Structure formats: C-alpha cells, structure tokens
Design an enzyme around this catalytic site. Structure first.
Site, PDB file in Angstrom:
ATOM      1  N   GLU A 114       0.897  -1.133   0.000  1.00 47.81           N
ATOM      2  CA  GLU A 114       0.000   0.000   0.000  1.00 47.81           C
ATOM      3  C   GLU A 114       0.958   1.210   0.000  1.00 47.81           C
ATOM      4  OE1 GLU A 114      -1.744   1.322   3.723  1.00 47.81           O
ATOM      5  OE2 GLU A 114      -0.672  -0.243   4.811  1.00 47.81           O
TER       6      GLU A 114
ATOM      7  N   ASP B 130      15.624  -4.035  10.827  1.00 49.33           N
ATOM      8  CA  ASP B 130      16.279  -2.877  10.250  1.00 49.33           C
ATOM      9  C   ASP B 130      15.453  -1.610  10.300  1.00 49.33           C
ATOM     10  OD1 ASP B 130      18.497  -1.600   9.097  1.00 49.33           O
ATOM     11  OD2 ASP B 130      17.764  -1.976   7.065  1.00 49.33           O
TER      12      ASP B 130
ATOM     13  N   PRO C  85      14.482   5.662  10.251  1.00 49.75           N
ATOM     14  CA  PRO C  85      13.488   6.655   9.824  1.00 49.75           C
ATOM     15  C   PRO C  85      12.957   6.470   8.409  1.00 49.75           C
ATOM     16  CG  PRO C  85      15.127   7.718  11.204  1.00 49.75           C
ATOM     17  CD  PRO C  85      15.649   6.312  10.893  1.00 49.75           C
TER      18      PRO C  85
END
Ligand SMILES: CC(C)Nc1nc(N)c(C(=O)c2cccnc2)s1
Length: 294
Positions: free
Chosen positions: A77, A123, A126
């Site tokens: 998505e 992992d 940001p």
C-alpha cells in the site's frame, strides 16, 4: 512492470528498488518493490507469504507478492512520506512532543504485534517508517536476513546505515531477538527529540564505540556474557557512562526513563514493546495531525 505504469522511483531499498506505481487496471496507487539471482529461494518466499497475513494498522500492508523472471516483486500500500523526510522537514522547529509520543506509541503497538507473531523487523530506521496525513505511522521494509541475509549494501553499491543497529548485532551475536527492534526504535525516539542522530557511526567499530562513549563500555555487571561475545575484544577502550540528562535534553524524565529501558545493553533487560506501551510516558498520549507538505 506489465500491469503497472511506474510513476516514479521512490527509493533504492537494501534489497532492491522501490517505485510508486499505478495498477493500470484498478487505478490503485501502490509502492512496488523489485527484488534483486537465478532461481530465487522457495523458503524465503514463505517468509514473505507469511508477511502478507501480518496485517496491523501500524504495519504497511503487503498487498501482493509476485515471482517472475528471477525478479521478485512486492506490492505494498502506498504512503506519501517517510519519517526521515518528515524529520528533515521539521528540523528548524522540531516535531512537537505530542506527535513524537504518538508516533513512538504507534510504532510500539506495531512491534508488539509483530513480536507476538514472532516476526522481527531487524532494520528499523526513519526511512523505513512511513506516515500519512491522518497521523498514522507504519513499519515498512521488514528485513529478511533470516530469509536472505545481511547485504553488503542494498543491491548495488550503497552505504548501509548502522546508526540504529543494536549492540549485540555489532558484537557478532548470531541470533537476533525482538530486543534488536526496541534498540533501533529507542535510537529513533532520541533522534526525533534532539533532531540529531544519537549514534551516527560510519563503520561497525565507530558505531560500537559511539555507543560505548555514551552509554559506557559494557561489562559483565551490566551485560552478563558480553565478554564472551564473538567480536568482543578485551582491548576495547573503557569509557564511562555519560549522564543520561545530557544525551536527550530537554526530554522529560518519563521520556528519559523509557528511553533508558529501550537502550539497556543486555537484550534481556531491554524493555519489551508490550511493557513499553504501559510506561508512564504514554499516560497522556493522543493522536495529533502532522503538518505534511506533499
Ligand atoms: C514516498 C514513499 C515514502 N512511499 C512509500 N510507500 C511504501 N509503501 C514504501 C515502502 O513499502 C518501502 C519503504 C522503504 C524501503 N522499501 C519499501 S515507500
């Protein structure tokens, strides 16, 4: 692809390339990841197939998995922005604490879910945390080292970020625990607050020593078994732990207390996502609307 009209290149993940694309038939806009090969594992794909059933509001939905021509495509998505970009965009003023708290809380909900289903991210950074205009934040790009392994880069010469790596990984532990994700999230939490990466290492040893310089070189007292770890060297310098109030000013004590538990050296002392959700820091948590410029 064939049934996909690639709008743009979203990025170049540690496994392949990600494109923004539109399903020429359904008109839906998605994130299409092409995976890096002659045959492709039939076991890893079952790791993948398992992820498709891993549905949660704070986990990017994996819509389809297509294997064809030594190529592996993952259809996700689409979300409009990642946390790295939002943090850069919010650098002058900083992300308001209520939103930081909201994002941290949602990410912990997402991890608590993953972890209870025995799925590790491995992992978090940001760039792998996606946000939308509704105030939601979701876990993306789950690492598949147990289904692929740790890549030297991403697929084609690209400096892998070590900033969020847990100490046990850097010390050569072969079996990661859910604790690795809590560590990464703690580093991200600190970065949202201070607007500066907590441990910006540029090599594995520099990463490890940056951690040691701040939290103190670990020993058997705070981390039983640490000196028997694969890459532990008795010759590591002995740095003293820095006052925690200097690390993430001006975060309040509830926040520093939670952060300290997310950054415990010992994977077994490190707080779980479930327990972290019950921490006093979240007593006044809400869900603010971020100011997103797309
Ligand atoms: C514009 C970007 C932030 N949109 C993205 N949507 C999804 N779903 C992405 C991913 O799913 C993703 C992110 C990072 C590495 N690999 C895949 S990136």
């Amino acid at each position: 692809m064939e049934n996909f009209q690639k709008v743009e290149k979203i990025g170049e993940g540690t496994y392949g390339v990600v494109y923004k694309a539109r399903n020429k038939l359904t008109g839906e806009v998605v994130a299409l990841k092409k995976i890096r090969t002659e045959g492709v594992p039939s076991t890893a794909i079952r790791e993948i197939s398992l992820l498709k059933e891993l549905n949660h509001p704070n986990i990017v939905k994996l819509l389809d998995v297509i294997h064809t021509e030594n190529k592996l495509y993952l259809v996700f998505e689409f979300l409009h922005q990642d946390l790295k970009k939002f943090m850069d965009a919010s650098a002058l003023t900083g992300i308001p604490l209520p939103l930081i708290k909201s994002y941290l809380f949602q990410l912990l909900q997402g991890l608590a879910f993953c972890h209870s289903h025995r799925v590790l991210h491995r992992d978090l950074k940001p760039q792998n945390l996606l946000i939308n205009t509704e105030g939601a934040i979701k876990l993306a790009d789950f690492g598949l080292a147990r289904a692929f392994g740790v890549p030297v880069r991403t697929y084609t010469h690209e400096v892998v970020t070590l900033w969020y790596r847990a100490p046990e990984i850097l010390l050569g532990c072969k079996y990661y625990s859910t604790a690795v994700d809590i560590w990464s999230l703690g580093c991200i939490f600190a970065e949202m607050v201070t607007r500066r990466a907590l441990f910006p290492g540029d090599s594995e040893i520099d990463q490890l020593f940056r951690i040691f310089r701040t939290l103190g070189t670990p020993d058997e007292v705070v981390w039983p078994g640490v000196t028997s770890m694969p890459d532990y060297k008795p010759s590591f310098p002995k740095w003293a732990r820095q006052d925690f109030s200097k690390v993430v000013p001006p975060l309040d004590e509830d926040g520093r207390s939670l952060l300290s538990q997310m950054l415990h050296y010992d994977p077994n002392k490190r707080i779980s996502a479930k327990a972290a959700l019950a921490h006093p820091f979240f007593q006044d948590v809400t869900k603010p609307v971020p100011h997103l410029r797309l």
